[PDB]
C-alpha cells in the first residue's frame, strides 16, 4: 500500500554533503576509490573566504565535501555580505559536528518543487528548522530542517550549475573516472529509538512506510510518493549475544547519524572489479566475503535470475544477492569510510520491477541475515 | 665553516607526524599520491581507544597520520592507564591544532642517542618543554620540545618496530607502492621573525648555520653536526610589489608552522612521472612549469652535469635545476597538500659532493629565484 501522502512535491535525491576537516584529501580519496569526477568547486579560488567545497559526480550521484577555513579570513563579513556559497554553513557548527562525530554526512539533500514551501510545510508539521529558505542569485532556493542527530534534510529547488557561486572544474583537473555508479538509492540513519524518529520524519514529510519482504536491530523505511526517495532508519536491539552494531555506531558516532549510503550501479560487476582493484592503493575496502556455501545456496534461490557464470562472478567479487516477491537485489558493503566504525557505503543493483524500474525493487537485503547465518553454519560443518 | 656544536648526539630525521581530522582518508590519499606503503598502525584494532595513527613509509621516509577518536571512548583512562601509543597525544591539543591550522605537521621527529638527555639538555638551554621523556615498553624513549608555532621537535631514541603498541600492517592491506622517494632531506618553517626563531632553535640544539650559495622572504638554515638534519626557516619581507607568500602562509595558517617537506628521490625522473600520472586521479598537483626559455638557459648553467636528453626530461616533467660551488640540485614543488595555501611538498635529488653524499649538496634552490624571474622576462620578449 502507498497512500501517496507527501505533504509537498519531492523529486529525487539531489546530493549528499560530508562535513570534513580537510575537504581536499577526502574528496581526492573518494574520487579515486569510487570513480567519481571532480565537477564543481567553491573555495578561495572562487572568492569563497568561508568554506572549501568540492563536488564529485558519477551519473546523477553528487557528493559534496566541505571544510571550514580559518574564521579570520571572513571575520569582517556578516550574513548579508557573506562570501560563502552555502549560506547555511557555519564555522562553529562544522567544527563541532566534526569534533563530535568525525567524518560523516551533514546533509541529505532532495530536490523539491519549491524549497520555501517545503520548508514552511515541514515546519508547520513539526520539523525542527535548521536553516531558513535562502534564494541564491534569484535562481536556486535552499532550506534545511533537522532529520536525526546532527544530520539535516536539505531542500533544494531550481527556477530553471550545481549552486550559484560554484565554478565548473577545469578539464585538466577533471579526469573522467567512472566505475558505473549512477545514483543514490537510499540513505540510512541510526537512531537510539526508532518509533519517535519515524513519527517525527513521517510527520513532517508525509512520507509513507515502505513494505519489506536476533540480528541486533529493528528498522523501517520511509518513502516519497513515487518511492524514489528512500530513508531507512535503524534502532539497536539490546541484550543479544553479539553486541548490536547499531549500538556500536551510536557509541563511536556520539549519537544518531547517517549509517550508510547505498549507491546504485548500472553494472555492479564492473563497479566492484574497479573498486576492489583500488582497495589497497587509496580506495575503499570491502566487508569479508560470505563462504562458498552461500554461493552454492544462490542456485536454489536466484537460479532463475542469474546464470551459473553470473553466480560465479558474484562469488569472485563477494556480492550478496537477495530477492523478495517483486525483484532481485545485488549488494555489497564497504568497510567504514574513515577512522571511526560509523559510516560505510553499499553498492547495489536491482533487477526487475520494470514498468522505468520502480523504486526499492527487491527490498534492502533483509533476507541476507538468515541466509548469511545459515551459510556460516553450513560452511563450519 | 662547521663548528660541530650540537649539544647532544643527533642521528637522522626519523618521522614526520601530521595531525588530521580523519587520518584514514589523508593517509590513503598520501599513499597513492606519493607511492608510500602502509607499514604500521595504532588504532581501535590494536587496542588504542585514544587516537588513530597510520604510518606510511618509502625507503627511510616515515609519514605518520594521527587523528583523535571521541574522548568518550577513553573517558575512564588516566595517563598511567592510557591506551594511547603516543603518550604526548592529547585530544584537546589535536582538535585545537587542527581547528587553528588545518591539516599540517605537528611533529618533526629526529632520532637521537638518548631522548631523555636530549630533552634535558635542550630545556637547560632554553627549549620550551612540550612533552617530557616517556619510556615505552622499556625500549623506546620519546620527548618533545617546542620548535615554532604549534610544531614540536620530537626526540626518539631506541635501546636496540616503529613504536611499541604499533602493529605491522597485514600484507593484504600493504600494497608495495614505490615511486622512488627515499628520505626526508629538509623541513622548512615559516615564522613572523627569523632572528628570534633562529636564536631559540640554535640556542637549544647547538645546530649551526648552514652556508648558502626582492623575492618576499629572508631565510637561514640550521644543521646538525654532519649536516644531515637540515631545518631552514623563512620570514616574510613586507612592502614588496607582489605580496609575500610567507605572509600569505602565516595568515592562512594562523601563525608560524611547517611550510614544506623536501623529499629526496633516488630517481627524480621516475618519481615525477609516477606522481604526475596520478595528479588528477587522487594524487598531488604540481606548481606551474617554468617557460621553455628556462630549459634553454639550463644548457649554459648545467650543461656539464646533464645531457641534452636529461635536460629535455627535466623540461617534460617541470623540474628546476640549481647549482652552487659543490653540487647540483634538481627540485620541484607541489601545490598545497590540503585546503589551505599553507604546507606543500618538494621533491629533490642532489648530484655531487661524493665523499656517501654530503648533506645539503647543491643548496636549496636560491639561484632559481633570479633564474625564474629572468626566464619569465625572456619568455615574454
Ligand atoms: C531495512 C534497512 C536496514 C537494513 O536491513 C538494510 C541493509 O542495507 C541490509 O543490507 C544487508 C543485510 C545483510 C547483509 C548484507 C551484506 C552486504 C550488503 C548488504 C547487506 C538497509 O538498507 C535498510
Ligand atoms: C633557504 C630556504 C628557503 C628556500 O629558498 C628553499 C626553497 O626550497 C627554495 O626552492 C625553490 C626556490 C625557487 C623556485 C623553486 C621551484 C621549484 C622547487 C623549489 C624552488 C628552502 O628549502 C630553504
Ligand atoms: Co542498504
Ligand atoms: Co626546499
Query: Which residue range(s) make up the domain with B200?
Result: 179-381
Q: Do residue A167 and residue A197 come from a single domain?
A: no
Q: Do residue A117 and residue A237 come from a single domain?
A: no
Distance A373 CA to ligand 2 centre (A): 60
Query: B338 CA to chain A: closest CA distance, Å?
Result: 5
What is d(CA B380, CA B22) in angstroms, rounded to the nearest whole number? 45
Is residue B349 in contact with ligand 2, taking CB distance under 6 Å?
no
Is residue A189 in contact with ligand 1, taking CB distance under 6 Å?
no
Q: Do residue A211 and residue A165 come from a single domain?
A: no
**Alpha-carbon distances, residue B345 vs A95, A376, B181 (angstroms):** 27, 49, 12
What is d(CA A142, CA A242) in angstroms, rounded to the nearest whole number? 43
Searching chain B, which residue's CA lies closest to the CA of residue A43?
B339
Q: Do residue A124 and residue A239 come from a single domain?
A: no
Q: Measured at the alpha carbon of residue B8, what is the angle toward residues B2 and B14, in degrees to the nearest 5?
A: 95
Q: Measured at the alpha carbon of residue B340, what is the angle toward residues A45 and A167, in degrees to the nearest 5?
A: 25
Looking at chain A, after which residues does the C atom sit over 2.5 Å from the next written N, breaking the chain? 160, 213, 355
Output the furthest CA–CA distance in chain B (Å, rounded): 70
Distance B346 CA to ligand 4 centre (A): 6
Q: Do residue A304 and residue A165 come from a single domain?
A: no
**Alpha-carbon distances, residue B118 vs A296, B65, B141, B258 (angstroms):** 63, 25, 11, 22
- Resolution value, angstrom units: 1.5
Question: Cβ separation of B340 and A31 shorter than 8 Å?
Answer: no
Question: Burial, A136: exposed, middle or buried (Cβ in 10 Å; 0-12, 13-18, 19+)?
Answer: middle
What is d(CA B99, CA A67) in angstroms, rounded to the nearest whole number? 10
Distance A289 CA to ligand 1 centre (A): 14
A:B CB pairs within 8 Å:
122
Query: B204 CA to chain A: closest CA distance, Å?
Result: 32
What is d(CA A344, CA A100) in angstroms, rounded to the nearest whole number? 18
Cell, residue A124: 508547520
Q: Do residue B238 and residue B286 come from a single domain?
A: yes
Q: Which residues contact A92 (CB under 8 A, 6 or more apart)?
A: none
Neighbours of ion ligand 4 (CB under 5 A): B 262, 346, 364
Is residue A219 in contact with ligand 1, taking CB distance under 6 Å?
yes
Q: Do residue B171 and residue B259 come from a single domain?
A: no
Question: Cβ separation of A340 and B31 shorter than 8 Å?
Answer: no
Q: Which of B254, B280, B283, B342 to mutate to test binding with chain A, by most A CBs within 10 Å of its CB?
A: B280
Distance A283 CA to ligand 1 centre (A): 22
Cβ atoms within 10 A of the Cβ of A72, count? 12
Residues of A in contact with B73 (CB under 8 A): 251-252
Q: Which of A335, A339, A342 to mutate to test binding with chain B, by most B CBs within 10 Å of its CB?
A: A339
Report the interhelical angle of A367-380 vs A292-302 (nearest 10°).
Answer: 130
**Alpha-carbon distances, residue B50 vs A341, A347, B90, B156, B356 (angstroms):** 14, 31, 9, 21, 42
Cβ atoms within 10 A of the Cβ of B170, count? 10
Searching chain B, which residue's CA lies closest to the CA of residue A279?
B173
Ligand closest to A375 (CA) is 1
**Alpha-carbon distances, residue A294 vs A312, A345, B45, B244 (angstroms):** 11, 22, 28, 64
**What is the position in ligand 2's atom list of the atom closest to the CA of B348?**
18
Phi, psi dihedral angles at B198 (to 5 degrees): -60, -45
3-state SS, one letter per residue, for chain B: CCCCCCCCCEEEEEEEEEECCCHHHHHHHHHHHHCCEEEEEECHHHCCCCEEEEEEEECCEEEEEEEECCHHHHCCCCHHHCCCCCCCCCHHHHHHHHHHHCCEEEEEEEEECCHHHHHHHHHHCCCCEEEEEEEECCCEEEEEEEEECCEEEEEEEECCCCCCCCEECCHHHCCCCCCCEEEEEEEEEECCCHHHHHHHHHHHHCCEECCCCCCCEEEEEEECCCCCCEEEEEEECCCCCCCCHHHHHHHHHCCCEEEEEEEEECCHHHHHHHHHHCCCCCCCCECCCCCHHHHHHHHHHHCCCCCHHHHHHHHHHCCEEEECCCEEEEEEEECCCCCCCCCEEEEEEEEECECCECCCCCCCCCHHHHHHHHHHHHHHC
Last residue of a domain, one of A148, A178, A208: A178
Q: Which of B19, B20, B21, B27 to mutate to test binding with chain A, by most A CBs within 10 Å of its CB?
A: B21
Question: Cβ separation of A339 and B23 shorter than 8 Å?
Answer: yes
Q: Do residue B192 and residue B328 come from a single domain?
A: yes
Q: Is the dihedral of CA B196, B200, B206, B211 positive or negative?
A: negative
Question: Cβ separation of A72 and B25 shorter than 8 Å?
Answer: no
Distance B106 CA to ligand 2 centre (A): 22
Is residue A221 in contact with ligand 1, taking CB distance under 6 Å?
yes
Cell, residue A16: 549528499
Cβ atoms within 10 A of the Cβ of B128, count? 12
Distance B291 CA to ligand 4 centre (A): 21
Is residue B146 in contact with ligand 2, taking CB distance under 6 Å?
no
* Exp. method: X-ray
Q: Which of A20, A22, A289 to mutate to test binding with chain B, by most B CBs within 10 Å of its CB?
A: A22
Is residue B151 in contact with ligand 2, taking CB distance under 6 Å?
no
What is d(CA B274, CA B267) in angstroms, rounded to the nearest whole number? 11
Phi, psi dihedral angles at A349 (to 5 degrees): -145, 140
Q: Do residue A18 and residue A8 come from a single domain?
A: yes
Residues of B in contact with A174 (CB under 8 A): 280
Query: B331 CA to chain A: closest CA distance, Å?
Result: 23
Distance A363 CA to ligand 1 centre (A): 9
Distance A215 CA to ligand 3 centre (A): 15
Cβ atoms within 10 A of the Cβ of A84, count? 21
- Nearest alpha-carbon partner for B267 in B336, B326, B319, B333: B319
Compute chain B's Rg from CA coordinates. 21
The SS3 of residue A118 is helix
Last residue of a domain, one of A124, A150, A178: A178
Selecting from A44, A95, A177 the residue whose C-beta is nearest the C-beta of B99 gives: A95
Is residue B332 in contact with ligand 2, taking CB distance under 6 Å?
yes
Question: Cβ separation of B281 and A175 shorter than 8 Å?
Answer: yes
What is d(CA A175, CA A37) in angstroms, rounded to the nearest whole number? 6
Nearest CA to ligand 2 atom 21: B364
Query: B252 CA to chain A: closest CA distance, Å?
Result: 7
Question: How many Å from the N-terminal Cα to the C-terminal Cα in chain B?
Answer: 42
Last residue of a domain, one of B160, B178, B196: B178
Question: Burial, B326: exposed, middle or buried (Cβ in 10 Å; 0-12, 13-18, 19+)?
Answer: middle
Cell, residue A345: 557505503
Cell, residue A24: 581536499
Give all strands (DSSP E) within chain A, no chain letters. 10-19, 37-42, 51-58, 61-68, 104-112, 129-136, 140-148, 151-158, 167-168, 181-190, 208-209, 217-223, 230-236, 257-265, 320-323, 327-333, 344-352
Q: Do residue B331 and residue B317 come from a single domain?
A: yes
What is d(CA B66, CA B62) in angstroms, rounded to the nearest whole number? 13
- Cβ(B184)–Cβ(B262) under 8 Å? yes
Q: Which among B212, B346, B372, B376 is the best mutation to test ligand 2's pocket, defined by most ligand atoms within 8 Å of the CB? A: B346
Q: Do residue B268 and residue B159 come from a single domain?
A: no
Q: Which among B328, B331, B349 is the best mutation to test ligand 2's pocket, defined by most ligand atoms within 8 Å of the CB? A: B331
- How many separate domains does chain A show? 2
- Cβ(B170)–Cβ(B156) under 8 Å? no
Cell, residue A30: 573518494
Is residue B268 in contact with ligand 2, taking CB distance under 6 Å?
no
Nearest CA to ligand 2 atom 5: B366
With cell 625564474, the residue in question is B372
What is d(CA B144, CA A179) in angstroms, rounded to the nearest whole number? 46
**What is the position in ligand 2's atom list of the atom closest to the CA of B368?**
13
Q: Measured at the alpha carbon of residue A337, what is the angle toward residues A331 and A342, in degrees to the nearest 5?
A: 90
Q: Do residue A199 and residue A300 come from a single domain?
A: yes
Is residue A249 in contact with ligand 1, taking CB distance under 6 Å?
no
Is residue A186 in contact with ligand 1, taking CB distance under 6 Å?
yes
Cβ atoms within 10 A of the Cβ of A315, count? 16
Amino acid at each position: 500500500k502507498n497512500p501517496k501522502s507527501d505533504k509537498f512535491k519531492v523529486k529525487r535525491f539531489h546530493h549528499i554533503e560530508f562535513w570534513c576537516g580537510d575537504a581536499t584529501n577526502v574528496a581526492r580519496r573518494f574520487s579515486w576509490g569510487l570513480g567519481m569526477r571532480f565537477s564543481a568547486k567553491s573555495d578561495l579560488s572562487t572568492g569563497n573566504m568561508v568554506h572549501a567545497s568540492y563536488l564529485l559526480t558519477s551519473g546523477d550521484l553528487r557528493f559534496l565535501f566541505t571544510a571550514p577555513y580559518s574564521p579570520s579570513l571572513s571575520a569582517g563579513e556578516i550574513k548579508p555580505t557573506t562570501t560563502a556559497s552555502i549560506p547555511s554553513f557555519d564555522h562553529g557548527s562544522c567544527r563541532s559536528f566534526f569534533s563530535s562525530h568525525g567524518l560523516g554526512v551533514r546533509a541529505v539533500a532532495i530536490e523539491v518543487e519549491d524549497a520555501e514551501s517545503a520548508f514552511s510545510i515541514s515546519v508547520a508539521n513539526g520539523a525542527i528548522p535548521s536553516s531558513p529558505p535562502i534564494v541564491l542569485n534569484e535562481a536556486v532556493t535552499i532550506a534545511e530542517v533537522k532529520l536525526y542527530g546532527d544530520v539535516v534534510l536539505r531542500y533544494v529547488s531550481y527556477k530553471a550549475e550545481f549552486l550559484p557561486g560554484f565554478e565548473r572544474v577545469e578539464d585538466a583537473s577533471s579526469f573522467p573516472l567512472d566505475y558505473g555508479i549512477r545514483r543514490l538509492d537510499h540513505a540510512v540513519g541510526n537512531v537510539p529509538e526508532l518509533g519517535p524518529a519515524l513519527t517525527y520524519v513521517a510527520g513532517f514529510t508525509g512520507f509513507h512506510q515502505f513494505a519489506e519482504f536476533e540480528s541486533g536491530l529493528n528498522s523501517a523505511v520511509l518513502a516519497s510518493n513515487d518511492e524514489m526517495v528512500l530513508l531507512p532508519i535503524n534502532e539497536p536491539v539490546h541484550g543479544t549475544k553479539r553486541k548490536s552494531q547499531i549500538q556500536t555506531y551510536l557509541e563511536h558516532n556520539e549519537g544518531a547519524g547517517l549509517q550508510h549510503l547505498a549507491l546504485m550501479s548500472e553494472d555492479i560487476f564492473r563497479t566492484l572489479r574497479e573498486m576492489r582493484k583500488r582497495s589497497s592503493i587509496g580506495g575503499f575496502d570491502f566487508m569479508p566475503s560470505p563462504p562458498p556455501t552461500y554461493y552454492q545456496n544462490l542456485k536454489k534461490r536466484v537460479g532463475d535470475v542469474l546464470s551459473d557464470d553470473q553466480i560465479k562472478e558474484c562469488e569472485e567479487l563477494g556480492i550478496l544477492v537477495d530477492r523478495d516477491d517483486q525483484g532481485t537485489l545485488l549488494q555489497i558493503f564497504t568497510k567504514p569510510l574513515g577512522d571511526r566504525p560509523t559510516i560505510f557505503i553499499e553498492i547495489i543493483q536491482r533487477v526487475g520491477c520494470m514498468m522505468y524500474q520502480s523504486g526499492g525493487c527487491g527490498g534492502f537485503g533483509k533476507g541476507n541475515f538468515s541466509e548469511l547465518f545459515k551459510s556460516i553454519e553450513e560452511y563450519e560443518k
